[PDB]
Amino acid sequence: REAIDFLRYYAEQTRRTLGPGHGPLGPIVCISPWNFPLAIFTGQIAAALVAGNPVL
Amino acid sequence: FGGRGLSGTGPKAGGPLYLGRLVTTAPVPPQHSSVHTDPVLLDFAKWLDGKGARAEAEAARNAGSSSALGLDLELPGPVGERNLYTLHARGRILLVPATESGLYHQLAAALA
Amino acid sequence: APAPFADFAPPVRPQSTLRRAITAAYRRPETECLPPLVEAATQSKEIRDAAASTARKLIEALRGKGVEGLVQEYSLSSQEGVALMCLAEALLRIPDTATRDALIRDKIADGNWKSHLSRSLFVNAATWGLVVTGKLTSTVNDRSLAAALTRLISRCGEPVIRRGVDMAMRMMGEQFVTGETIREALKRSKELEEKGFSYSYDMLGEAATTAADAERYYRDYESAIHAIGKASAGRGIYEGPGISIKLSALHPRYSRAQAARVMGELLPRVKALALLAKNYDIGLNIDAEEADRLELSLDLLEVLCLDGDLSGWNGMGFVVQAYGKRCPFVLDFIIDLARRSGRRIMVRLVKGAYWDAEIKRAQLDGLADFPVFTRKIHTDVSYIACAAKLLAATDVVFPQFATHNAQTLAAIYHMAGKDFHVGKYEFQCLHGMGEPLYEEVVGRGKLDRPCRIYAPVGTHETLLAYLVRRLLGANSSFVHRINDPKVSIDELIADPVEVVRAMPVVGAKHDRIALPAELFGDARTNSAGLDLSNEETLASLTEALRESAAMKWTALPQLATGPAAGETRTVLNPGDHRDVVGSVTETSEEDARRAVRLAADAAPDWAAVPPSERAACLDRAAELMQARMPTLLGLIIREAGKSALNAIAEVREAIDFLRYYAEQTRRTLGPGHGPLGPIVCISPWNFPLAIFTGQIAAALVAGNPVLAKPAEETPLIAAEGVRILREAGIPASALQLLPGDGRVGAALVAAAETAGVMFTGSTEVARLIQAQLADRLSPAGRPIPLIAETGGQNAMIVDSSALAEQVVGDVITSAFDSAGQRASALRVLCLQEDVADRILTMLKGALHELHIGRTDRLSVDVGPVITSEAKDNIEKHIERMRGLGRKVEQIGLASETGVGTFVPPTIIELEKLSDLQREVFGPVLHVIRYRRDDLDRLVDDVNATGYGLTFGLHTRLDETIAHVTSRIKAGNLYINRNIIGAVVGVQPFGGRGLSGTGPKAGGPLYLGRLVTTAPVPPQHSSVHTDPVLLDFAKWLDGKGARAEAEAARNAGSSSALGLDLELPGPVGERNLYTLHARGRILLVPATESGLYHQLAAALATGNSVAIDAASGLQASLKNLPQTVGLRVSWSKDWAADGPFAGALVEGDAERIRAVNKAIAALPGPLLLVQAASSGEIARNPDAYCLNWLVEEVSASINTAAAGGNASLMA
Ligand SMILES: Cc1cc2c(cc1C)N(CCC=O)c1c([nH]c(=O)[nH]c1=O)N2C[C@H](O)[C@H](O)[C@H](O)COP(=O)(O)OP(=O)(O)OC[C@H]1O[C@@H](n2cnc3c(N)ncnc32)[C@H](O)[C@@H]1O
Ligand SMILES: NC(=O)c1ccc[n+]([C@@H]2O[C@H](COP(=O)([O-])OP(=O)(O)OC[C@H]3O[C@@H](n4cnc5c(N)ncnc54)[C@H](O)[C@@H]3O)[C@@H](O)[C@H]2O)c1
Ligand SMILES: [Mg+2]
């Protein structure tokens, strides 16, 4: 559920905010832990991606 | 979700400041504003006016308005719970200026 | 010399039987109005079924067929939609289309909009909020809107800006108005006139503030009549277009109080417009306004319809409001006038547009009931009953049924029956709102009944002024309900007549709206006022006032043993020294000293009267004053020079004090709250009944016998107040009256048995009393309590978002009401530079519409100043300012003022606030200008006077409200209203610094100062703990001072710092009461433990401290945490380190007396000093009472200022 919520929340925050002047950083390295191995994994990656950054 | 000190850097995961850290120019998050103006910022702006530092005084007034310090929101959630989100001062900011004008701008940002 | 009150308020004309029937219904109970309306509105079962079918068909058409689509297309939030429309509004203020488009493409869309657009973008965001969300907010969250505008532009750029511009252009040019100018409106009317509609044009003028404004509205109406009549081209008054006017647009003093000027000056103007309408044969309709203008407008209608120069024309029209209780009786009068004159009067029946404001005004004025219904369904029944009356008289009047309610329409359609011809009656609707409904009505293919469109005409500026009232789509509104999908058609076609008929109590008042008498519920009974627009009231008051002037009023030294002999002199009317009001016998200094001794002897007997019974005496005195109000008014008018309106409000305030302190007593006082003993009450001339009564009632009900020393100028009303309190049961030994001057006051203050002094008056005299009390201690060895409520230097700050007409009304009232002889009066008006010229022009024009004279005439706005000495003092200030080159504006006084002591209302333009150095207690307004960036420095300048009584702010912007109210230091704040007339228990009154010691009169801390152990007031607590107090308690625990750390934590809990309450009051206002820190407290300790207890008390209440360095206790505060150190200073020279806001002293009796003398000698404000011995600190945790270490702040916010009351819309 938390992974789903991260995806939908960062999607909605993107629709509310991001425009052509909010340029991406570039490649983002997302390093995640074993204790939320889907939710924190997905949350970091989803945020970086939807902000316009490719992810490792 | 997220904290301060040894608990991390912020911004909070699952919160409205998160995406702004992942772009080179941050947007204005939804509902991110405050009608409160820091009183020490106001005193600093008047001091700058007295010195004739008109550009810096203007920057200080603008920082005072655009600061969201004092934001106090209730977030939608389940019944039987009240879920609050607030923006407070961070603490003591390390300022590393090079020029007098840069120092005045950094001070305005921190005070605001 | 004119006889007193012989010309008080004569009516325009003798009241006919029909006119008296109107006045009799003004405030008739709602349960009495409805039954005859239900009877008149009843129709046959066949008709009701037919009407429901017709209404269903119309509503089905309406549901089966703008900004919403824009919000959807760009996924805008509500705040983004509002911000976008404010931006579009600002861009449309750029006249040239090409430069606007370049600003959008090259500067607005590409980034910073703030750089390119003295006035907030968001000044009208309350209006656009209504457009976008359907909900009204009184003030604008301009920081939220700025954030949303930046967000939406950065997200969507130029396209969303262009769409917003096009949307706002359509709405403001085509939807909210028919056209920007009358020519444009006339061009756009051809389309629907070809479909069977007609038009009535509204030039959006109302509420003239100045003669120049009234002349502007006149020439605007005249030019419109020419354009409409040229276009009418002989179509006549039924097929062709007409005009609608508001009488308040045509004269700046359109009121019953100025009836003579209205008939002399306003009437000829309306006649001239009507003559032009007659020559073109168009309709001219008089719109209906507030309830207190209804009957006045009938006098103009009567003269116009009887004027032979207007004969031959049937175009005169007149609105009647069905939400008003007088409506059927007004219609009887109009129908009869139409018969007598032979004029077929055009009668527009509306429901009514001022509902919120009428509820608020009746509550504020303490009147018997409302002049409008309180349930919407009652207005609907009234409308239908009045339509039946009008449909029975179509041979003599032309009924015009203005409504958008399809059920109301259908009921009238079938009520009117089958016979119809154009000219028999018509329907009416509002442009851009009723055409969907009436496109189903007009024409042979529909119901074949005509409809006249009410068409607003004006620029964007004019449109936005009163657009909020027009939108109030409330909640019970048909237009709101037709759009609500949760509302079925069956609900929409419900018959209000049958619903009212079947309710348990027909006509019951709305459950959630308080009658004025019940504003405070079970706590106490509100005082009742008098309606000076009611002819029955004016006629009764005329006689009661004349009778009061025939009385041989006297004031005598009324000792416990009986009246005493003394020097006797007359009391003269300050408006005319030929008018002798009465005689005063003044008190010898020997008898004043004797009075205190008798009070001390009688003190045990009065203290033994149980608190509940003492409060019963106060309630009985309140009943007596309410009953005697007309006579008390007359005395106040003639002795103190007050207008009738102000005298009513003063007697109300006296009644309110009596009932408030009685209730506070019943809530708090018990056996352990022992009286102080004899209390000397010294009162000023300017509220000679209310402040006089307030101080005495508080002291008496707290269990103290009282020596009452009234101002030497106003002894008669004081003697009458004492007579009333004694009649109510106050024993003669408990309340003694000592008339005379300050020497009598001084002898009372100096008397050995005086246990407390309550003073209201000048700061200079209070300082003399403080110096005399500094020599004295109570038998217990504590300072003699002094409550001293003194002057003000009160400011109002106005920014470019405020509404100039609102500002000018509140400034004229605040500065010149009572000839500026209120402690609360506005002394310094501060105008933002970009609106200062326009507001100042309006203010000067309004100044010259004031009537100055002897106050036994209702038409007088401003009376005299109290004495020749006061007049000389005030005029000396004016001439000094004039001698310095400052611009001075003064109205010219009539020769009749020569027999009294008058100062003309005066406006003085200053360069800096420091040009003004002392309170000038008269009708003298000072004006300064400021740049918006210097607002914070301006607030500094206001605080820098050292005063802190009343303060006003006019702004619509939340950021400015938050800033200014957080930085101003004053006891009574007012937002978007005037700054005078604080109400007992609603705006508890009193300030800080040079303005007083506190506690506030009419507030919950007052009685506790008048007993030796203060009670816990109602609602007096706080869950907040001062964080520096907590740091200090931890520091104490670290130092091993465990008992003191415990006492510090207890102080932190016991403190009520942070209390934040809303007090009950009228609708349309929010009245807040809060407890703050006082400031910097002077600490004068003797021992280490004493210092820790003093510091704990001060920090727990949010204060900083200056500690007496001569105590030698510096080593007791080694290594304080920095948070506490920030609050602590050491003072060798107390006078150099002030002003302080209070003091805490430790020592024996001789030490306390010596410190008290040194504190009294400090410059500036009187300090509330608390003293205790070291032993008392050890024994009594409350040795220093936290009640006196916080500062009370009252704030009153006019939440109807945006044009309506959102809470009442539900
Ligand atoms: C259509 C129209 C309206 C008005 C005027 C002309 C025309 C053609 N006219 C001039 C325009 C304004 O200056 C006018 C109006 N009102 C007024 O006081 N003086 C005037 O000269 N006009 C407005 C009119 O009174 C009314 O406000 C509206 O048309 C709305 O009424 P409508 O009948 O279309 O809607 P309903 O929803 O069935 O009724 C709403 C009205 O009901 C009353 N109300 C609301 N709450 C109430 C409570 N709690 N108690 C009692 N009455 C209540 C109000 O009167 C509300 O307006
Ligand atoms: N803060 C408030 O609530 C409030 C309300 C009304 C008026 N005021 C102030 O009152 C002033 C005007 O009223 P006023 O002209 O009657 O005030 P004042 O100071 O001239 O006299 C007030 C009373 O003090 C008495 N008095 C004069 N000298 C005295 C002395 N040496 N010892 C004892 N008593 C003495 C007078 O007889 C009078 O009864 C204004 O400064 C106004 O601001 C304050
Ligand atoms: Mg005096």
Ligand 2 center to C787 CA (angstroms): 12
Mutate which of C326, C350, C404 for ligand 1 pocket (most atoms within 8 A of beta carbon) = C350
Which protein residue has the closest C-alpha to ligand 2 atom 32?
C746
**In terms of CA atoms, which chain A residue is nearest residue C151?**
A17
Residue B3 in tokens: 């904290």
Residue A3 in tokens: 């992974």
Torsion C163-C165-C168-C172 (CA) sign: negative
Taking the CA atoms of residue C212, residue C216, residue C221 and residue C226 in that order, the dihedral angle to the nearest 10 degrees is 120
Put simply, whether A16 touches C (Cβ < 8 Å) is: yes
How many Cβ atoms are within 10 Å of C366's Cβ, its own excluded?
23
Residues of chain B in contact with residue A9, where contact means CB-CB under 8 angstroms, are 14
Ligand 2 neighbours, Cβ below 6 Å, are C 682-687, 691, 709, 711-712, 741-742, 745-746, 749, 760-762, 765, 768-769, 789-792, 823, 919, 921, 949, 995-996
A19/C77 touch (CB, cutoff 8 Å), yes or no:
no
The answer to whether C1098 and C1170 have CB atoms below 8 angstroms apart is no
* Nearest Cα to Cα of residue C954 among C973, C938, C970: C973
Which protein residue has the closest C-alpha to ligand 2 atom 18?
C761
Residue C1070 in tokens: 């929010």
Paired with C1129 in beta bridges are: C1106
Say if strands B72-75 and B83-86 run parallel, antiparallel, or are unpaired: antiparallel
Q: How far is B65 from B56, CA to CA, in rounded Å?
A: 14
Ligand 2 center to C867 CA (angstroms): 14
Q: How far is C759 from C996, CA to CA, in rounded Å?
A: 10
- Closest partner CB to A21 (pick from B13, B22, B25): B25
The answer to whether C823 and C991 have CB atoms below 8 angstroms apart is no
Question: Which atom of ligand 2 approaches the CA of C768 most closely?
Answer: 31
For the stretch B41-50, contacts whose Cβ atoms lie closer than 8 Å and that sit 24 or more positions apart, written own/partner, are: B41/B67, B41/B108, B41/B111, B41/B112, B42/C936, B42/C963, B42/C967, B44/B107, B44/B108, B44/B111, B45/B108, B45/C936, B46/C936, B46/C937, B46/C940, B48/B104, B49/C933, B49/C934, B49/C937
Question: Which atom of ligand 1 approaches the CA of C1208 most closely?
Answer: 49
Q: How far is B94 from B85, CA to CA, in rounded Å?
A: 26
* Nearest Cα to Cα of residue C903 among C852, C954, C861, C839: C852
Put simply, whether C154 touches A (Cβ < 8 Å) is: yes
The answer to whether C907 and C843 have CB atoms below 8 angstroms apart is yes
Q: Output the CA angle C120-C122-C128, nearest 5 degrees.
A: 160
CB pairs under 8 A between A and C: 16
C154/B37 touch (CB, cutoff 8 Å), yes or no:
no
Put simply, whether C112 touches B (Cβ < 8 Å) is: no
**In terms of CA atoms, which chain B residue is nearest residue A22?**
B25
Q: Would you give the DSSP letter of residue C262?
A: I
Q: How far is C851 from C822, CA to CA, in rounded Å?
A: 19
Residues of chain C in contact with residue A15, where contact means CB-CB under 8 angstroms, are 75
In Å, how far from its chain's centre is CA B72? Answer: 13
Put simply, whether B46 touches C (Cβ < 8 Å) is: yes
Q: How far is C526 from C516, CA to CA, in rounded Å?
A: 7
**In terms of CA atoms, which chain B residue is nearest residue A29?**
B22
Q: Is C405 near ligand 1, meaning CB less than 6 Å away?
A: yes
Q: Would you give the DSSP letter of residue B99?
A: S
Chains touching B (at least 3 CB pairs under 8 A) are: A, C
Residues of chain C in contact with residue B33, where contact means CB-CB under 8 angstroms, are 141, 143-144, 146-147
**In terms of CA atoms, which chain C residue is nearest residue A18?**
C155
Put simply, whether C137 touches B (Cβ < 8 Å) is: no
Packing angle between helix C611-627 and helix C715-727, nearest 10 degrees? 120
Residues of chain B in contact with residue A53, where contact means CB-CB under 8 angstroms, are 22
Q: Which residues of C878-888 are buried (b: 16+ CB within 10 A; e: fewer)?
A: beebeeeebee
Residues 6+ positions from C80 with CB-CB distance below 8 Å: C71, C74, C148, C149, C151, C152
Experimental technique behind these coordinates = X-ray
Question: Which atom of ligand 1 approaches the CA of C480 most closely?
Answer: 37
A22/B25 touch (CB, cutoff 8 Å), yes or no:
yes
A6/B13 touch (CB, cutoff 8 Å), yes or no:
yes
Is A23 annotated as ligand-binding?
A: no
Residue C634 in tokens: 């007359």
Chains touching C (at least 3 CB pairs under 8 A) are: A, B
* Nearest Cα to Cα of residue C32 among C441, C418, C428, C325: C325
Mutate to test the interface with A, among C76, C155, C161 (most CBs of A within 10 A): C155
Ligand 3 center to C762 CA (angstroms): 7
Q: How far, CA to CA in Å, does C330 sit from each of B15, C363, C377?
A: 62, 24, 20
Residues of chain A in contact with residue B19, where contact means CB-CB under 8 angstroms, are 10, 13-14, 17-18, 47, 50-51
* Nearest Cα to Cα of residue C1002 among C773, C545, C629, C663: C663
B30/C963 touch (CB, cutoff 8 Å), yes or no:
no
SS3 label, residue C469: helix
For the stretch C1134-1138, contacts whose Cβ atoms lie closer than 8 Å and that sit 24 or more positions apart, written own/partner, are: C1134/C1082, C1134/C1106, C1134/C1108, C1134/C1158, C1134/C1159, C1134/C1162, C1135/C1161, C1135/C1162, C1135/C1163, C1137/C1106, C1138/C1080, C1138/C1082, C1138/C1106, C1138/C1162, C1138/C1163, C1138/C1164
Residues 6+ positions from C818 with CB-CB distance below 8 Å: C642, C643, C646, C686, C825, C862, C863
Mutate to test the interface with C, among B23, B24, B33, B40 (most CBs of C within 10 A): B33
Report H helices in C517-610: 535-549, 589-607
Q: Is C356 near ligand 1, meaning CB less than 6 Å away?
A: no
Q: If you search the block for the tokens 């080593």, which residue do you land on?
A: C1115
Question: Looking at the CA of C764, which ligand is closest?
Answer: 2
The answer to whether C178 and C158 have CB atoms below 8 angstroms apart is no
B16/A13 touch (CB, cutoff 8 Å), yes or no:
yes
Ligand 3 center to C913 CA (angstroms): 26
B19/A52 touch (CB, cutoff 8 Å), yes or no:
no
Q: Would you give the DSSP letter of residue C996?
A: B
How many Cβ atoms are within 10 Å of C164's Cβ, its own excluded?
26
The answer to whether C1166 and C990 have CB atoms below 8 angstroms apart is no
C967/B31 touch (CB, cutoff 8 Å), yes or no:
no
Q: How far is C74 from C57, CA to CA, in rounded Å?
A: 36
Ligand 1 center to C588 CA (angstroms): 65
Put simply, whether A26 touches B (Cβ < 8 Å) is: no
C157/A18 touch (CB, cutoff 8 Å), yes or no:
no
C154/A21 touch (CB, cutoff 8 Å), yes or no:
yes
Q: How far, CA to CA in Å, does C708 sit from each of C158, C676, C737, C762, C1170?
A: 74, 16, 5, 18, 26
Ligand 2 center to C707 CA (angstroms): 16
C936/B35 touch (CB, cutoff 8 Å), yes or no:
no
Question: Which atom of ligand 1 approaches the CA of C380 most closely?
Answer: 38
Say if strands C1128-1131 and C1104-1108 run parallel, antiparallel, or are unpaired: parallel
Segment holding C1172, helix H or strand E: strand C1169-1172
Question: Which atom of ligand 1 approaches the CA of C348 most closely?
Answer: 6
Is A40 annotated as ligand-binding?
A: no
Ligand 2 center to C1122 CA (angstroms): 44
Residue C41 in tokens: 């509105």
Q: What resolution, expressed in A, was reported for this entry?
A: 1.5
